[PDB]
Nucleic acid binder design. Structure first.
Lengths: 147, 79, 48, 57, 48, 93, 132
RNA sequence: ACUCAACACGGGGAACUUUACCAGAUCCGGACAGGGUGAGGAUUGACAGAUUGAGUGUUCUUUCUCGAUCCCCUGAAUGGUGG
RNA sequence: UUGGGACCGAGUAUUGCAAUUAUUGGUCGCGCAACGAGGAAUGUCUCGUAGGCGCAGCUCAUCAAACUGUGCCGAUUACGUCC
């Protein structure tokens, strides 16, 4: 179909952030990967078409007319893309603060690294092309004899 | 079933297409005419006809270095 | 590359428009983040 | 002579289950019939009688 | 500068890239690649 | 492929020609009473072209072909064979 | 050394067509009789050509053919023949013990199979086998 | 084709054909001529040698042999067990 | 075991344009290869039926442990209930 991954535009609202716990009446509690503590909401195209769990990472928006009102979840990042994001160069895995930075909660927590793609297979596509219009030897039984 | 689109191993000299190899004014190259003796014109030929019913009309034979040939009945009188 | 601002649906609609106005396979070449522009490209699509 | 002698030959010999081809269409899959030397099962017999056949039993 | 020039350039590059795509249909890594995705899809389907 | 003329002479005094759909040659009236013999593919080509020019009216049933040839057909033919006619059906009845 | 029926090379060569097909197995006999009328028009010639021309101390130049429905007679022994499995001309030289056979028998037409771990769907009971 | 209404089922017991699939070569079955081709035209077929899996004119060399629709270029048509 | 044959080597004839990855028959050797009434579970049957046995048609150069049809030999139990 289409892309499963988008990047924040720093202008026009939109900043990465992580869910903490969940609260009633469609709202939840939400915390900033630089700033202090927040409360979020959700949009009505995700009211039960999409479920945003706790400690899932998402992309907010912010109000244009007035800051420091409330913010809203306008997207979700699938776990597949979270590991990728966090790797590259981008967001902290500790979500600066955590609850708070002055209590330094949840210490390392040493890196995990998705270094598990290659298993030591999948080496060499640099080899032969077809040989056709040649008589060549190639009888089986090979190895079968060492005498 | 199923299908795909791609054919090219290629990158050889491919065949030229056969194309007619022209002789111009073919009749005059066969029939030979002479200086006029006695007011009568003497007509000779460098092409002699094949003796088979199919070739029995006007249909001439051929001339190669090492063979003679008939393109009508696909025959060889060898030289 | 990784960095893009543009949302997918945007792109895909333009890409669609290429198919129909296809000429030099501006289609393929644009899909490769690889694009051409001059006078021999139609005004619409070159803007895109 | 040349190419023409090498094109369409091995089933103007007529052999195997090739060179069958039904009368009613021309399809040669799904059995031409040899049973009383009729042909109908490739345009299906459910579609066409007018031969005098009917299911009585 | 125009005309044939820019088209030779673009074309040739699309060629080269499509070429290198073919070489990676020699298929080792790409093979495991397909082998995976497929597995995941099947699993998801079964679960649903 | 100059059995053309023969085929056209089978047309005129009939108005109708028929042939099997087959790639292996056979005579396309099965008897003409002039005992012509033509391939199958050659026949097929002739009537195909003239069809696209509007001179033929085509019918297919089963593994065969039935060829009728129009009023228009008669015109084209008379000019090609350089011959007038009273008309094809009046002679036959 | 080699004994076809207790015959070395020189006796075999000496035999005329009649005396030959008498000596060989039932297939070979059946083949020859049914055929007549050439039916290896080129595959004789090409061999005997390059055979002759050799200065010895090495094999003839290789010849290629698709065909494999043709016998092996004592005439064609010593040659180097191609036989075609549907993508590769394959190298065979013709020994004195290849008489009474065909060509195709020496040219494999498949890779023998050696497996590589069974995936899911093999074992009915379900575990969703990691990782192959 | 996949619980019962998939699994000696697709009349499916396939040597070639059948046959979709793979390696390689061939043929127009591109109608319809608006645009080009003097008597030679544009054109068809081929012995021999060579190429080639091929005593396959496929193609070339060579010369002979033949409807001028066959032939050359765009548009269009067509066929397909392709989706 | 003379019960069963599976595998396996040699010779021969027919079918076909082509039987090599044995095609089909037909006699010698291989039998010392399995297997000694079969766990959990499970299939469809009420009289010319169940079961045993053979023949033909079908496909079709050749090959039927399949399918369709016909015949021969021919029973035990129940003819009830809703678990």
């Amino acid at each position: 179909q289409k892309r499963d991954i988008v990047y924040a535009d720093p202008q026009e609202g939109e900043e990465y952030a992580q869910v903490k716990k969940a609260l009633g009446n469609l709202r939840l509690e939400l915390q900033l990967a630089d700033g202090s503590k927040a409360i979020g909401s959700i949009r009505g195209a995700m009211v039960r078409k999409v479920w945003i769990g706790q400690g899932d990472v998402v992309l907010v928006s912010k109000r244009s007319f007035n800051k420091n009102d409330i913010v809203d979840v306008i997207h979700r990042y699938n776990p597949a893309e979270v590991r990728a994001l966090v790797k590259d160069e981008v967001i902290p895995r500790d979500f600066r603060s955590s609850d708070e930075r002055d209590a330094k909660n949840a210490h390392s927590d040493y890196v995990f690294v998705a270094e598990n793609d290659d298993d030591g297979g999948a080496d060499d596509d640099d080899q032969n092309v077809l040989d056709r219009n040649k008589v060549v030897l190639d009888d089986p039984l090979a190895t079968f004899d060492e005498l | 079933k199923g299908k795909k689109k791609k054919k090219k191993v290629f990158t050889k000299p491919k065949k030229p297409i056969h194309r007619h190899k022209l002789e111009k004014m073919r009749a005059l190259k066969y029939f030979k005419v002479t200086e006029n003796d006695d007011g009568s014109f003497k007509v000779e030929r460098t092409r002699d006809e094949c003796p088979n019913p199919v070739c029995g009309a006007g249909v001439f034979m051929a001339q190669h270095k090492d063979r003679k040939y008939c393109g009508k009945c696909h025959l060889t009188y060898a030289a | 590359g990784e960095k893009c601002t543009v949302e997918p649906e945007v792109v895909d609609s333009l890409m669609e428009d290429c198919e129909k106005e296809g000429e030099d396979l501006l289609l393929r070449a644009l899909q490769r983040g690889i694009g051409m522009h001059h006078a021999g490209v139609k005004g619409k699509l070159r803007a895109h | 002579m040349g190419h023409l002698e090498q094109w369409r030959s091995r089933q103007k010999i007529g052999m195997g289950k090739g060179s069958r081809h039904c009368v009613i269409c021309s399809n040669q899959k799904a059995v031409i019939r040899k049973y009383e030397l009729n042909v109908c099962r490739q345009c299906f017999r459910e579609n066409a009688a007018n031969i005098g056949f009917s299911k009585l039993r | 500068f125009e005309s044939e020039d820019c088209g030779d350039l673009v074309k040739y590059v699309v060629e080269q890239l499509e070429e290198a795509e073919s070489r990676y249909r020699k298929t080792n890594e790409f093979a495991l690649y397909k082998a995976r995705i497929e597995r995941a899809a099947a699993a998801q389907e079964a679960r649903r | 492929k100059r059995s053309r003329d023969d085929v056209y002479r089978f047309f005129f005094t009939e108005g109708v020609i028929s042939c099997k759909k087959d790639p292996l040659g056979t005579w396309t009236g099965s008897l003409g009473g002039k005992t012509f013999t033509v391939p199958s593919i050659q026949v097929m080509q002739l009537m195909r072209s003239m069809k696209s020019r509007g001179l033929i009216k085509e019918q297919f049933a089963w593994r065969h072909f039935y060829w009728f040839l129009n009023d228009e057909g008669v015109e084209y033919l008379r000019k090609y064979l350089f011959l007038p006619h009273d008309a094809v059906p009046n002679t036959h009845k | 050394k080699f004994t076809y029926r207790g015959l070395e090379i020189d006796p075999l060569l000496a035999l005329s067509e009649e005396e030959f097909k008498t000596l060989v197995h039932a297939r070979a006999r059946r083949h020859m009789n049914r055929h007549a009328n050439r039916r290896a028009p080129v595959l004789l010639k090409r061999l005997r050509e390059a055979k002759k021309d050799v200065k010895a101390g090495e094999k003839p130049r290789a010849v290629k053919t698709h065909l494999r429905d043709v016998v092996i007679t004592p005439e064609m022994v010593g040659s180097v023949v191609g036989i075609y499995n549907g993508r590769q001309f394959n190298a065979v030289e013709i020994k004195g013990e290849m008489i009474g056979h065909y060509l195709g028998e020496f040219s494999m037409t498949y890779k023998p199979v050696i497996h590589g771990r069974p995936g899911v769907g093999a074992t009915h009971s379900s575990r969703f086998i990691p990782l192959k």
